[PDB]
Every structure is written in structure tokens, then in C-alpha cells.
């Protein structure tokens, strides 16, 4: 095996849609915002912008994680790579 994954890899790098389902993301955002203040209302464009920015952040994170994994002569990505990427980028330690 090892080629159906590359099929996806090539497919998703061309299409430009939202890879996360909208309703769970909306529920997550509402629950996260509940703590700061109760009884909030959300503009739909605000939620869409949130989801777009989060997806872009995750894509960049996984790009750097893949670079980290390749550095150590591996193909599988593990949290040992994500922690290193976050540390050296500057969001932690």
C-alpha cells in the first residue's frame, strides 16, 4: 500500500473548502465564549472567519510538523514533532 494516501494528499492540495463540519465548530466556539460572558450572539461571518483562520493555522502547523518529522529520518508525525515546532516557532517555552 502507501499510494491511496498520496491520492488524498494530491486531491486536497487542489480543492479549497472547509475541512471541518460547521455545526460542531459553532458549538465549540459558543462553549468557549460562554466562560468570558454569558448570553452572547455571533455574526455568521465572524464564525466563518474564525474557522478559516483556524484551518490556515492548522495547515501551517502540520507543514512545519512534516518538516520536523522528515528531519529525523521518519515518515510518521508524532507529538514529539508538534511540540518541537511550537517551541521553535515561539508559542511555548
Amino acid at each position: 500500500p502507501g499510494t491511496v494516501a498520496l491520492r488524498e494528499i494530491r486531491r486536497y492540495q487542489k480543492s479549497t473548502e472547509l475541512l471541518i463540519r460547521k455545526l460542531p465548530f459553532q458549538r465549540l466556539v459558543r462553549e468557549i465564549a460562554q466562560d468570558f460572558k454569558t448570553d452572547l450572539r455571533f455574526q455568521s461571518s465572524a464564525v466563518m472567519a474564525l474557522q478559516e483562520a483556524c484551518e490556515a493555522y492548522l495547515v501551517g502547523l502540520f507543514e512545519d510538523t512534516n518538516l520536523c518529522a522528515i528531519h529525523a529520518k521518519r515518515v510518521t508525525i508524532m507529538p514529539k514533532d508538534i511540540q518541537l515546532a511550537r517551541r521553535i516557532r515561539g508559542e511555548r517555552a
Partner: protein
């Protein structure tokens, strides 16, 4: 069932995002860790987005608020206003 909505970010969604990132193999411990990271990011934007809503004495969070919040973190977003 009473389940936290962070688990609403399904495993296939994370796999799709990873495949868009260009990765061949995915270990099984990424799935719980990535969600945690996704929490932290939303803990540094919505917090700001609410504060602007405080300063305008409004009750509805608008897209301009989140765009300004992302702008100050060196992560400017295009095409959603501003």
C-alpha cells in the same frame, strides 16, 4: 449524551487537515494533542473578540471584531471585512 464539544472536531477532519498539510503517516497520539492546540488558539482570539464587544457596549460579536483580534496577533485575514 453529555459530551464536550472539543471532541466534535472529528478524527477524519484532523486527517483531512493533515493531508492538506502534506503528510503521509499519522501516529495515533496526534488526535488528542491537536485538539488541545486548537483550544489554545481559540483561547487567544475569542478572548480578544469579546473585549472589543465590551468596548462598543454591544451584545453581538461581529466579524470586524475577530478580524481586528487576528490583526494584532500578526495573523491578518483577508476577505472578511476591513
Amino acid at each position: 449524551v453529555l459530551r464536550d464539544n472539543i471532541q466534535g472536531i472529528t478524527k477524519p477532519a484532523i486527517r483531512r487537515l493533515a493531508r492538506r498539510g502534506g503528510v503521509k503517516r499519522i501516529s495515533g497520539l496526534i488526535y488528542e494533542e491537536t485538539r488541545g492546540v486548537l483550544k489554545v488558539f481559540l483561547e487567544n482570539v475569542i478572548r480578544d473578540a469579546v473585549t472589543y464587544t465590551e468596548h462598543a457596549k454591544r451584545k453581538t460579536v461581529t466579524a470586524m471584531d475577530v478580524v481586528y483580534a487576528l490583526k494584532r496577533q500578526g495573523r491578518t485575514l483577508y476577505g472578511f471585512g476591513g
